[PDB]
Amino acid sequence: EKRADLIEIGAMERFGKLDLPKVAFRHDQHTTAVTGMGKDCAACHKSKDGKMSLKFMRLDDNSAAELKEIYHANCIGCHTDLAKAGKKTGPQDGECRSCHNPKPSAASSWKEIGFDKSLHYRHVASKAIKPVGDPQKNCGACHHVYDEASKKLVWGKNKEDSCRACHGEKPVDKRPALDTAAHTACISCHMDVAKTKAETGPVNCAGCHAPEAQAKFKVVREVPRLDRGQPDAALILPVPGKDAPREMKGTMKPVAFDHKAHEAKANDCRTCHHVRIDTCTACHTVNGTADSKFVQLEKAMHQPDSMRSCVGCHNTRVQQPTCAGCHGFIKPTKSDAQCGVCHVAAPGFDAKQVEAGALLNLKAEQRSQVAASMLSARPQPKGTFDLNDIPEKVVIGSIAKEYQPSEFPHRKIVKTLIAGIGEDKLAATFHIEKGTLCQGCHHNSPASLTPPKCASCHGKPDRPGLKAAYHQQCMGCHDRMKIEKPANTACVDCHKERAK
Numbered sequence: 112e113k114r115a116d117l118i119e120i121g122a123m124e125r126f127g128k129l130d131l132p133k134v135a136f137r138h139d140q141h142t143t144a145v146t147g148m149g150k151d152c153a154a155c156h157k158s159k160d161g162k163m164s165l166k167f168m169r170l171d172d173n174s175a176a177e178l179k180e181i182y183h184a185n186c187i188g189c190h191t192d193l194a195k196a197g198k199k200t201g202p203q204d205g206e207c208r209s210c211h212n213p214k215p216s217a218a219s220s221w222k223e224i225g226f227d228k229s230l231h232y233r234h235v236a237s238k239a240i241k242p243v244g245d246p247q248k249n250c251g252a253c254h255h256v257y258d259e260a261s262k263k264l265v266w267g268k269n270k271e272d273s274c275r276a277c278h279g280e281k282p283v284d285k286r287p288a289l290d291t292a293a294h295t296a297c298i299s300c301h302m303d304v305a306k307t308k309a310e311t312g313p314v315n316c317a318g319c320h321a322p323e324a325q326a327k328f329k330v331v332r333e334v335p336r337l338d339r340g341q342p343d344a345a346l347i348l349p350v351p352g353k354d355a356p357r358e359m360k361g362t363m364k365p366v367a368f369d370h371k372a373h374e375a376k377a378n379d380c381r382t383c384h385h386v387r388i389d390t391c392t393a394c395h396t397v398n399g400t401a402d403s404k405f406v407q408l409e410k411a412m413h414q415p416d417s418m419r420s421c422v423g424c425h426n427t428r429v430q431q432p433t434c435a436g437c438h439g440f441i442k443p444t445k446s447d448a449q450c451g452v453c454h455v456a457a458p459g460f461d462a463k464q465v466e467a468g469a470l471l472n473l474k475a476e477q478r479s480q481v482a483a484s485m486l487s488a489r490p491q492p493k494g495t496f497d498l499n500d501i502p503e504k505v506v507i508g509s510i511a512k513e514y515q516p517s518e519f520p521h522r523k524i525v526k527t528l529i530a531g532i533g534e535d536k537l538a539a540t541f542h543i544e545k546g547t548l549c550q551g552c553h554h555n556s557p558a559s560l561t562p563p564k565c566a567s568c569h570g571k572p573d574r575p576g577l578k579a580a581y582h583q584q585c586m587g588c589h590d591r592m593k594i595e596k597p598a599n600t601a602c603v604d605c606h607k608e609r610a611k
């Protein structure tokens with residue numbers, strides 16, 4: 112009952128109220144049958160100048176009357192001819208309700224489809240897609256901008272973007288809507304390559320929009336960089352923008368951004384460039400603009416719950432079990448030091464000149480030099496204290512009573528925690544002190560080789576008592592890290608039975 116190929120035909124509703132229900136149409140069911148009878152798309156779609164219309168048996172919608180005749184004459188005509196041939200067929204001319212069906216045809220499994228970097232690269236890498244306007248580059252086969260001089264579309268070198276950047280839910284001006292744009296360009300090419308029997312893309316509705324079909328697409332794990340002329344190192348500045356006089360100026364040190372490293376770890380460009388490839392400050396000025404619906408630069412970069420912001424995406428990262436043990440327990444400090452991981456001094460510039468705009472009109476190559484400098488000048492990772500310098504096992508028995516004191520495997524766990532982190536660079540860079548990792552459990556005191564006892568703040572005598580403090584911390588981390596043994600229900604694996 113789940114289908115991804117449903118079309119609810121309701122085109123004449125634009126001309127006025129419909130007398131009868133819209134007509135449900137299974138496109139994949141129809142192309143399969145048409146193929147089997149030796150026909151193709153041309154059975155139902157006309158073309159004009161080598162471009163196939165996506166409309167049924169027409170190039171324009173001229174009137175309600177004309178449209179009704181096109182549907183009835185052509186839809187029913189085929190059904191009738193198949194009937195007298197004694198073949199499987201659809202509703203006959205007199206079965207009004209069988210097409211004009213008030214009850215839904217099937218359920219919809221339809222899913223949107225898009226290019227992650229793997230799929231985009233599988234297209235870039237295809238021999239079947241030939242270079243355009245270049246000895247090697249493939250880009251012009253798919254990407255365009257409108258050239259006002261020639262009054263036509265041309266490949267705009269290094270101005271390639273997702274189709275969504277210029278094609279919307281509805282056709283604005285002579286830019287078609289996204290669905291028309293994609294259905295036209297994508298499927299047309301797929302059908303051409305299919306003729307050469309070189310590997311190609313889907314033509315069936317289900318082939319693109321069915322979750323089952325999507326799961327089957329070959330994925331490439333190591334995907335080459337998609338180079339469109341973007342910086343390796345970006346310099347993000349508190350851009351005020353022309354509007355709002357006086358306008359807000361920045362108050363922090365500037366931020367250098369390793370754009371190249373982030374590409375390698377992200378799954379596309381759009382994740383961050385959510386409207387179009389450009390700066391962020393084009394819309395998210397310090398004060399915000401109408402074009403950002405007044406979302407300010409600060410929000411764009413710090414929004415804790417958005418995948419688009421520095422802090423937000425990093426926040427999803429720390430929800431990994433290897434991180435979540437500590438990160439589901441600790442509270443951010445918002446200390447100057449932590450802010451300083453991103454906001455750093457620029458070489459040769461003072462604070463007064465940066466939030467004066469001294470950097471705003473520098474050439475891309477020059478700001479890259481400045482940014483790369485800021486990136487390389489960041490101190491080397493201090494790592495963690497030598498684990499041999501902390502107790503290997505601590506006895507937790509301050510409140511022993513019903514059980515024996517816990518013999519806590521202190522050093523072994525810390526070692527596992529560092530192992531679990533591995534070469535994660537987000538962990539390496541933001542864990543700025545030798546004892547930062549220690550604070551994942553020893554919270555609310557400075558990073559140190561010698562943190563105070565929990566009892567110094569808990570249940571001695573807001574805050575939990577000492578037993579609650581232990582249980583919540585121990586059991587909590589194990590749940591978040593998916594630690595199987597010990598089980599939280601195993602009441603003796605952390606503190607052995609009284610006597611017995």
Ligand code: HEC
Pocket residue numbers: 120121122123124128129130131132133134179182183186187190201202203204205206207208209210211
């Ligand atoms: C499937 C093969 C059809 C059969 C059998 C009948 N109709 Fe139909 N009709 C069909 C389509 C694809 C459309 C367009 C639907 C839309 O809303 O765009 C139509 C259109 C009409 C209309 C005009 C639109 C409306 O007012 O709802 C009418 C009045 C109409 N159809 C009538 C009608 C009757 C009475 C039929 C039995 C004699 C009949 N239809 C059969 C598809 C099919």
Ligand code: HEC
Pocket residue numbers: 118120122136138141142145151152153154155156165166167168290294295298314
């Ligand atoms: C007649 C039985 C059809 C055959 C064979 C093919 N298509 Fe079709 N298509 C048909 C209809 C009735 C419609 C709805 C438009 C209308 O004027 O009522 C369509 C629509 C499409 C679409 C758009 C889908 C959507 O956006 O909802 C596409 C992209 C499309 N069709 C492609 C297509 C191709 C490539 C075909 C051969 C493989 C083909 N169609 C055959 C009817 C029929």
Ligand code: HEC
Pocket residue numbers: 120134135136137140141144145154155167182185186187189190193199200201202209210
């Ligand atoms: C031959 C070129 C056809 C044209 C043009 C249209 N249809 Fe059709 N239809 C055709 C066949 C051979 C079948 C049966 C397919 C099968 O495998 O059973 C059908 C069936 C339908 C149905 C019934 C769907 C179902 O519930 O099983 C409907 C409602 C239907 N057809 C609608 C329809 C409309 C509205 C068309 C114009 C847009 C149309 N069809 C054209 C063959 C052909």
Ligand code: HEC
Pocket residue numbers: 162253254255256257263264271272273274275276277278285286287291292293295296297
């Ligand atoms: C803005 C930079 C655009 C991006 C990114 C994409 N498209 Fe586009 N497209 C754009 C304009 C200004 C127009 C209208 C041209 C005119 O004559 O005024 C278009 C048009 C199309 C069309 C229609 C013409 C045709 O090819 O038959 C298609 C099919 C189309 N666009 C597809 C398309 C796809 C698939 C894109 C992502 C790969 C894409 N466009 C991006 C502007 C822009």
Ligand code: HEC
Pocket residue numbers: 224225233234237238239240252253293296297298300301304310311312313319327328329
């Ligand atoms: C030529 C100019 C194409 C355009 C435009 C689009 N696609 Fe494509 N596609 C093309 C080829 C040559 C191939 C084969 C690549 C290979 O592996 O050799 C493909 C393949 C796909 C696939 C993968 C199918 C599978 O793995 O089974 C999909 C899902 C796909 N294509 C989708 C797609 C979409 C949605 C497009 C516009 C947004 C699009 N393609 C354009 C060639 C061309």
Ligand code: HEC
Pocket residue numbers: 115116117118138222223224225289290293294297298301312313314315316317318319320
């Ligand atoms: C992969 C090459 C496609 C094939 C084959 C078909 N569709 Fe498609 N469709 C495709 C894209 C890339 C898009 C744009 C949005 C997206 O999914 O990325 C669409 C869009 C639609 C829509 C419009 C959804 C909306 O937001 O209004 C529908 C309902 C739709 N597509 C239907 C459809 C049908 C019925 C097809 C067979 C005729 C079909 N599509 C094929 C990509 C591809």
Ligand code: HEC
Pocket residue numbers: 347348349350360361362363364365366397408409412413421422445446449450451452453454
């Ligand atoms: C990297 C993950 C960030 C951390 C950690 C913090 N900030 Fe940030 N901030 C970041 C970016 C990418 C930007 C835009 C570039 C710029 O420097 O303007 C910002 C911007 C601000 C702003 C607005 C601009 C300004 O007033 O100068 C403020 C007020 C700001 N940042 C404050 C701030 C503080 C107090 C932080 C620690 C709690 C902090 N930031 C962390 C990136 C990152």
Ligand code: HEC
Pocket residue numbers: 224225226227231234235240248249250251252253254271272273274275337338339379380381382388
């Ligand atoms: C047609 C088969 C393509 C070729 C060849 C190239 N691109 Fe592409 N690109 C294509 C599509 C359909 C899309 C949008 C996919 C979506 O789901 O939105 C794109 C997108 C881009 C982007 C934006 C990345 C993103 O986050 O979506 C860029 C920067 C881009 N394309 C660049 C690019 C370049 C430089 C290419 C030649 C090396 C190139 N593209 C080829 C389809 C196709």
Ligand code: HEC
Pocket residue numbers: 337338339340341342345346347348368370373374377378379380381382383384388389390391392393
């Ligand atoms: C978030 C992790 C990003 C990913 C993934 C990609 N980009 Fe990016 N980009 C990002 C930021 C924060 C910035 C700085 C913008 C600012 O306001 O300073 C950028 C900048 C660019 C630029 C430079 C534009 C300019 O300075 O005029 C380009 C051209 C660019 N980005 C392109 C791009 C492409 C094509 C990507 C996929 C291959 C891509 N970016 C990913 C953040 C992120």
Ligand code: HEC
Pocket residue numbers: 383384385386387389390391392393394395402403404406410411412413414416417419420
């Ligand atoms: C104008 C074309 C914009 C550019 C360039 C960037 N953004 Fe944006 N952004 C814009 C709008 C219209 C909105 C509000 C509507 C919306 O899409 O949410 C936003 C919003 C954000 C947000 C907030 C998300 C949330 O959940 O609250 C963030 C964090 C954000 N944008 C980030 C961001 C970044 C990092 C960009 C450069 C890569 C960027 N934006 C550019 C408009 C525009």
Ligand code: HEC
Pocket residue numbers: 366367368369372373376377382383412418419420421422424425428452453536537540
């Ligand atoms: C997911 C969409 C991310 C967004 C948006 C941003 N970051 Fe990021 N960050 C992310 C990962 C998965 C990584 C590891 C890959 C890497 O680039 O090393 C990181 C790491 C950092 C680091 C440490 C390493 C480095 O590249 O310098 C810093 C200092 C950093 N991130 C900064 C940063 C800023 C300032 C961003 C907003 C402009 C930002 N990140 C976005 C994932 C994602």
Ligand code: HEC
Pocket residue numbers: 425428429431433434435436437438441442443444445446449528531532535537538541542547548549550551552
């Ligand atoms: C306990 C041993 C830790 C583990 C395991 C991980 N992190 Fe961590 N991290 C920890 C502390 C005590 C702090 C200091 C918080 C403060 O505000 O002073 C941090 C901080 C970070 C940050 C900075 C932003 C923040 O969330 O406060 C990041 C981005 C970060 N850590 C990332 C991170 C990742 C990706 C980890 C798993 C690979 C990870 N951390 C583990 C303690 C501990």
Ligand code: HEC
Pocket residue numbers: 507508509510511512513514515516517578581582585586597598599600601602603604605606
């Ligand atoms: C390790 C992950 C634990 C599990 C599982 C359980 N407990 Fe626990 N508990 C733990 C610690 C580190 C401590 C402190 C030890 C001390 O004596 O200081 C405790 C403490 C208690 C106490 C209070 C002390 C006492 O009366 O002996 C009780 C009564 C207690 N815990 C009960 C208990 C039960 C019934 C459990 C099974 C559900 C259980 N704990 C599991 C660590 C861990």
Ligand code: HEC
Pocket residue numbers: 495496498501502505506507508519521524525528546548549550551552553559560561562563564565566
């Ligand atoms: C959670 C998994 C821990 C991490 C990460 C680190 N330590 Fe820890 N330590 C932890 C507990 C539950 C206790 C018991 C404290 C109590 O009050 O019962 C301890 C204790 C210490 C002590 C002894 C304190 C005292 O008894 O007065 C020291 C000196 C100590 N731990 C140091 C330490 C350091 C420096 C770490 C980072 C390398 C570190 N711990 C990590 C839990 C956890």
